[PDB]
Every structure is written in structure tokens, then in C-alpha cells.
Symmetry: C3
Subunit: 108 residues, 3 copies
């Protein structure tokens, strides 16, 4: 009776609140993945810029060294790391998809 009506009301409430939180969680992890993508892009681009600067400086120094060795009678280690978050972002995508699969559809 009224215990059953109250139990059904509570079931509906739990379902609504859980689905709302589920949408919120989906959104949060999707934004986290997009932010990780942008972070990877920025970090890798700045690492490429640093490597390009080092290589350009080395090339110019070599050219100057050739010019100097011409007036004489002579013959003639920076490590940049690239960021790789591909697998982690794929796992995050699968997490978001499981959250998709976790929607609650009550029997009326």
C-alpha cells in the first residue's frame, strides 16, 4: 500500500538523481579529455619549438665554424620529450561510453 507507494517514489527519485549525476560525470570526463588533448598539443608544439631552436643554433654555429676554418687552414646534448597521452585518452573515452551505458530506465 502506502509503503509501496513510498518505495516507488523513492525508486523514481534515486533514478532521476543518478541519471542527472551521470550526465554531469559524462560532461566532466569529456572536458577532462579535451583539456588533456589541448595540453598535449601545447606541450608537444613547445617541445618542437625548443628542438627547432637548438637545431637552428647548431646549424648557424656550424656555418660560422666553416667560415672560420676557411681563413685558417683546417679541415671541417639537449633532450626534449614529447608527450603521449593517446592510450589514456582512449581509456577515458571508453569510461565515458560506459557511463553512457549506465543509464537507469525503471519499469513503470
Amino acid at each position: 500500500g502506502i509503503t509501496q507507494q513510498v518505495l516507488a517514489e523513492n525508486q523514481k527519485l534515486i533514478a532521476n538523481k543518478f541519471n542527472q549525476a551521470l550526465g554531469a560525470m559524462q560532461t566532466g570526463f569529456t572536458t577532462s579529455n579535451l583539456a588533456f588533448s589541448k595540453v598535449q598539443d601545447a606541450v608537444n608544439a613547445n617541445a618542437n619549438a625548443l628542438s627547432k631552436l637548438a637545431s637552428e643554433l647548431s646549424n648557424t654555429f656550424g656555418a660560422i665554424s666553416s667560415s672560420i676554418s676557411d681563413i685558417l687552414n683546417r679541415l671541417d646534448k639537449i633532450n626534449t620529450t614529447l608527450l603521449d597521452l593517446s592510450d589514456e585518452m582512449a581509456i577515458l573515452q571508453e569510461v565515458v561510453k560506459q557511463l553512457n551505458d549506465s543509464y537507469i530506465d525503471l519499469k513503470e
Copy 2:
């Protein structure tokens, strides 16, 4: 009978575990926001440092070239990018808020 009582007990258990997990989620997303802000700060600061190094070398190389040319005649290829996560962090805040207003307050019995 006992089945209705067990169902009410299980409802209470479900709501309690859900609210616990909800608080946990909120803390995790707030922490993700903090970490993303710190990452943005560090990345942009080191990008500005790289840009300053590049421009410094450019100015000095130009000065030396000008001297050699004064006796001889009568680095924008390095481009750094900045990090912007403001929209992502704001939507993370909104996620935390929607999680906040999702707590379950069950009708007792």
C-alpha cells in the same frame, strides 16, 4: 513482509553509497581543475621563457650582423603556443555544481 523491510533497507544503502560516491566525484573533479590550472600556468610560463630566449638571441645576432655589415657594406621561425583551458575549467565547475545538486534525500518509513 521481511521483503518490504529488506527493500527499504536496500534503498537506504543505495542512497548512502550514492551520496558517498557523489562527494568523491566532486572532490576528484575539483582536483582535476586545480591540476589543470597549475599545468596551464607552468606551460605558459615556460613558453614565455622560450619566447624570451628566442627574441634575446635574435636581438644579439642582429646587433652582431649590423656590426659586421657596418665594416663590410656601405627568430620568428620559432613560434611558441600558449595554453588556454578557461572554458574547460568553467564547464568542470558546472559539472561539480550539477553533482552538488544531485544528492538523494529519501523519504523515510
Copy 3:
């Protein structure tokens, strides 16, 4: 009857919640992994930038010493003031793993 439906609906609720719970644990764990990786990469590249700046400083110093020697210039910071910022997310990662711990402790084991 509606009582049978209530029971099976409760089971469905608990199962979908535990599914989502595992999903969130995985999500925050991989977020922690990604944050550790970005910290490592950012700090390594900051060290690389600093090393480039310092080696350029020393090389330019030797060259200026030679030029001053040929000029008999007697007197002996900018590129040595290029200071990088290193990333420290330790507190955030610890908070994240304790969040994953609480999510572990939030699993639903229904009574029959």
C-alpha cells in the same frame, strides 16, 4: 505484481550504479596517469630549455673572452636569468587516488 517489479528495479539500479562506479574509478585513475605524464614531460622540457640557455651562456662567454683578449679589454645575466617553472602536482595526485579509494569503498552489495 508491483512488488516483483520493485525488487527487479532495485537490482537494476544497483547494477547500473556499480557499472558507473567502476567507470569513474577507471576515469580518475587514467586522469592521474595523464597528470603524472604531463608533469614529467613539462619538467623535462623546462630542464632542457634551462640547459640550452646555460650552455649558450657559457659559449658566448668564451667567445666574448677571446674577443676581449684580442682587444685587451680587462673587465670580465639576461640569458642566465631565463628562469623556467617546474610543475608539482603531488598534492593533486594524492587527492585523486584517495578519491579513487572512496569510490572503491562506495560499492553497493544488496541484501537478498
